[PDB]
Design a protein around this ligand. Structure first.
Ligand SMILES: [Cl-]
Length: 321
């Protein structure tokens, strides 16, 4: 546990603040509740005297002294599909049902826990060398830094927009043209599950091109300039082409008129955003040599795309036999 020793004097305009509130302002490196625990446990002196009432009001000019002490994520046996690894980086093909980094609702079971198990020295790299995210139910490529120099350099490459991250997706609706969504993204004001386009969000740019038309769906490839939470899903939804199977931004599946039983079945069962990180291209953070990796389209999407393709081709003739 780490020994904490801190001194300061309450500023005159802090007159009337609670002891815990005033200490929080003087020492913002330490959480509010932490400071409260320190006070109650007789670890704060005020003018050479122990003061243990967190609610007690300061006057300004009080000399404060604290003498206290302090005290991460666990490795988990979770298999990873490693596409490429060298001394500096790892490229993984992430399956669905796998969160990248611990957060609210997912304390563990994540790619980060998996990395801590596979290569324990990665604990010395910020966020276990994870430099960009994929959603839990998005499949495909991620690059991960194994070392501190590699991580710093990959982060610089992202800031300078020198990493290409391409995805393949199936979107709802007929789309006429490729283009760009450049709309900032924030947390949704009222729906805690959602992100949203919002003037006060973080700037976000997605480029998209049409690979193939289906009857009431469209296959896309996208390239990101930024990697905000849910960026593709929310941008595609914003322009009224939410991703097939998206459980948050999509609505009820709408099959086209006269869709086969197999088409209707495949479409209704598809229970994740039809979204896959398909290609990554970067300058190696150590050698600066240009490199490119591909993750094959997963079977779930292959079946979805083939059914939609057979449907579109069939209904380009008066054929029903
Ligand atoms: Cl994603």
């Amino acid at each position: 546990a780490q020994r904490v020793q801190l001194t300061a004097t309450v500023s005159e305009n802090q007159l009337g603040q609670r002891l815990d509130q005033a200490l929080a302002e003087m020492f913002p490196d330490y959480s509010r509740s932490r400071i409260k625990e320190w006070i109650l446990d007789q670890r704060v002196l005020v003018n050479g005297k122990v003061c243990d009432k967190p609610k007690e009001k300061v006057l300004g000019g009080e000399q404060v002294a604290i003498n206290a002490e302090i005290e991460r994520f666990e490795p988990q046996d979770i298999p990873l599909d490693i596409v490429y690894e060298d001394e500096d980086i790892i490229i993984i093909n992430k399956p669905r049902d796998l969160v990248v980094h611990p957060g609210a609702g997912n304390p563990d079971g994540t790619v980060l826990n998996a990395l801590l198990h596979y290569y324990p020295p990665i604990a010395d790299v910020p966020r276990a060398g994870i430099v960009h995210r994929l959603d839990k139910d998005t499949t495909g490529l991620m690059v991960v830094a194994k070392t501190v120099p590699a991580q710093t350099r990959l982060v610089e490459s992202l800031q300078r927009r020198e990493i290409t991250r391409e995805y393949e997706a199936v979107a709802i609706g007929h789309m006429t043209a490729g283009g760009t969504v450049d709309e900032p993204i924030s947390r949704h004001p009222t729906k805690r599950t959602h992100m949203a386009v919002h003037p006060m969000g973080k700037p976000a740019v997605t480029h998209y091109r049409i690979m193939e038309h289906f009857r009431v769906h469209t296959r896309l490839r996208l390239r990101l300039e930024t990697g905000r939470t849910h960026q593709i899903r929310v941008h595609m939804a914003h322009i009224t082409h939410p991703l097939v199977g998206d459980p948050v931004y999509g609505g009820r599946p709408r099959p086209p008129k006269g869709a086969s039983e197999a088409f209707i079945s495949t479409l209704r069962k598809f229970d994740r955003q039809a979204l896959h990180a398909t290609m990554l291209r970067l300058y190696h953070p150590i050698s600066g040599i240009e490199m490119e990796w591909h993750a094959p389209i997963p079977q779930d999407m292959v079946e979805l795309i083939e059914v939609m393709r057979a449907d579109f081709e069939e209904h380009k003739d008066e054929v029903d036999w």
